[PDB]
Design a protein around this motif. Structure first.
Motif, short mmCIF file in Angstrom:
data_model
loop_
_atom_site.label_atom_id
_atom_site.label_comp_id
_atom_site.label_asym_id
_atom_site.label_seq_id
_atom_site.Cartn_x
_atom_site.Cartn_y
_atom_site.Cartn_z
N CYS A 187 0.85 -1.16 0.00
CA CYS A 187 0.00 0.00 0.00
C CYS A 187 0.92 1.26 0.00
N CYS A 244 -0.01 3.25 3.81
CA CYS A 244 0.37 2.65 5.09
C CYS A 244 1.47 1.61 5.06
N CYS A 296 -6.06 -1.17 -0.54
CA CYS A 296 -5.63 -1.60 0.78
C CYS A 296 -6.83 -1.74 1.72
N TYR A 331 -6.83 -1.84 4.94
CA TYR A 331 -6.64 -0.96 6.12
C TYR A 331 -6.93 0.51 5.78
N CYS A 332 -6.69 0.92 4.54
CA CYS A 332 -6.81 2.33 4.21
C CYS A 332 -8.19 2.61 3.66
ZN LIG Z 1 -2.96 1.00 3.45
#
Ligand SMILES: [Zn+2]
Ligand SMILES: NC(=O)c1cccnc1
Ligand SMILES: NC(=O)c1cccnc1
Ligand SMILES: [Zn+2]
Lengths: 326, 325
Positions: free
Chosen positions: A158, A161, A182, A184-185
């Motif tokens: 990513c 992050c 991603c 998480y993002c």
């Molecule tokens: Zn990310």
């Protein structure tokens, strides 16, 4: 001649006017190459996309190559698709074409095997490859002896992050022309698509996964400079194979290696901006076989019976230059 | 430290980006410099015209320097009087001004003697000087230890036939603003300059002093020496120079990165990264240093200098303004 240290920029770039390297008086022939092969202990092998075209993988610059396909699609500059800064601004440019560069797997050429041969005989200092097809490891080249100068699709990261996953996880999205995002993002990414959280300060690459191949304008993997710092002090033969040598800093290896070290090219075309001691002009698989054979060696690859049973022609064509056919 | 390749240093005198050198974390006081002087054995001193202004010799670019005294010429770049292409094309431009740059004799400054002091303590690897005044000889600095990077008036050379003569044979012509002519080329010279083809230049059969002009190659001692010296140098001290002319100005890039670099100069050198910069007059700062080392400069002005109180005001890390009163 008087010199100072010129820092070698480690960002991937077109290299793009006489070359200043001087060719060795003592080393032009095929037989010179052969004796060196028998005595050398620290060979540097530098490879490009030429060493994978026998396998049906296009190269970049030739008639049926990647650049020609991207141009035929309508891009004004086909170079754009592997441009880092472009990726960071608009990752759809690359992901529109990425399915074309996803490699096959579990195959390798006679050339990759000729490289493993050297390793087994205790003569390979490093193979510096430009190729992102990741075929060296399968061919048996040890991980300490392989430098993937421009990375591979082994993993993707990513850009926001720096979460990293196996590349394979995004291949189906790439085949279906979908932007790999991603996990998480993703929630912030949806929020964006406070001044600092709006156009123009959030780029379209926000929370996008990028394969860990080196783009033009991006820093090479750290393995590259760490390795070459040291391999430069100790290399005693440099062989360049299946590359136009148009991409720095890989292309600077020829200038970094100490001037007393013999440099050999094996390639279909001469490299005009370099001054190789010996050039062997033809197909690399053929020239490998030929060379191994003159050495009394064998290439641990299926095609070796066959390649070894050919009639090789070596036409001199200017000193230190042979046109090899068969 | 960054991965590097070899780049040829251009050996043509050229008036000269950003600087890449990283300053040493353990060397930035005056005491680091005093300690290093005690132990150094292979010191490179690089000088320029600031080392002779105490003797009444103008430097080049100060407000009463040489370029200030030829303002009346109205040149776009007053360095052009020392440009080599200009010389080859029209030597009367240099020869109008050459009288102004003839050296005095038999004088030298306390800073010149500080260099000789280093020499006689076995610590001088080399004095690279940009000065043509030849005053280092008078101060006792050895010919082996001296590199006259930009030559001198010691010899003069015919630009056509390469005949070489003592430079003093042309001084009376220089003083009279006349072209010094080669006696061997003279017959052809007089034929062409009483027909003359357009490809004969005005420099045909003209003697040139063996000072290095802008656009000319440096004397061969320079590249021969520097190549070996940068391998051995253990301290670089740059004194009385703006460091604006290459390749001399590249010495600071060529010395390995671990070697301490000290500037002694009226002004900072903004395009270089000295570990320590001492800002004031050479002679005073040389004396103060020699005092702190418990050394003697072999110069008649030593007793006057050893009687001064020097103030060293730290401005920034490794920058000190040194004055006297
Ligand atoms: Zn990310
Ligand atoms: N077709 C391509 O774009 C391509 C694929 C693999 C290697 N080089 C180029
Ligand atoms: N004698 C000289 O070298 C000189 C240098 C600069 C200005 N004036 C004289
Ligand atoms: Zn002459």
């Amino acid at each position: 001649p008087l010199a100072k240290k010129q820092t070698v920029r480690l960002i991937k770039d077109l290299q793009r006017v006489l070359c200043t390297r001087l060719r060795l008086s003592n080393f032009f022939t095929i037989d010179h190459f052969i004796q060196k092969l028998h005595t050398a202990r620290k060979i540097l092998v530098l490879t490009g996309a030429g060493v994978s075209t026998s396998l049906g993988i296009p190269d970049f610059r030739s008639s049926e190559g990647f650049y020609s396909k991207i141009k035929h699609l309508g891009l004004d500059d086909p170079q754009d698709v592997f441009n880092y800064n472009i990726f960071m601004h608009d990752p759809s440019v690359f992901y529109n074409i990425a399915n074309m560069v996803l490699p096959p797997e579990k195959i390798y050429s006679p050339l990759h095997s000729f490289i493993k041969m050297l390793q087994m005989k205790g003569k390979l200092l490093r193979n510096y490859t430009q190729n992102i097809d990741n075929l060296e490891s399968y061919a048996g080249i040890s991980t300490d002896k392989l430098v993937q100068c421009h990375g591979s699709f082994a993993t993707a990261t990513c850009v926001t992050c720096h979460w990293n996953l196996p590349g394979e996880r995004i291949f189906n999205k790439i085949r279906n022309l979908e932007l790999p995002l991603c996990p998480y993002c993703y929630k912030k990414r949806r929020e964006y698509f406070s001044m600092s959280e709006r156009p123009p300060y959030i780029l379209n690459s926000y929370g996008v996964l990028k394969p860990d191949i080196t783009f033009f304008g991006e820093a090479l993997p750290n393995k590259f400079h760490k390795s070459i710092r040291e391999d430069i002090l100790e290399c005693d033969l440099l062989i360049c194979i299946g590359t136009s040598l148009k991409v720095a800093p890989v292309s600077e290896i020829v200038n970094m290696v100490p001037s007393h070290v013999p440099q050999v090219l094996i390639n279909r075309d001469p490299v005009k901006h370099a001054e190789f001691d010996l050039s062997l002009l033809g197909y690399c698989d053929d020239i490998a076989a030929m060379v191994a054979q003159k050495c009394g060696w064998t290439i641990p690859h299926k095609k070796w019976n066959d390649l070894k049973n050919k009639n090789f022609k070596c036409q001199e064509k200017d000193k230190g230059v042979y046109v090899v056919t068969s």
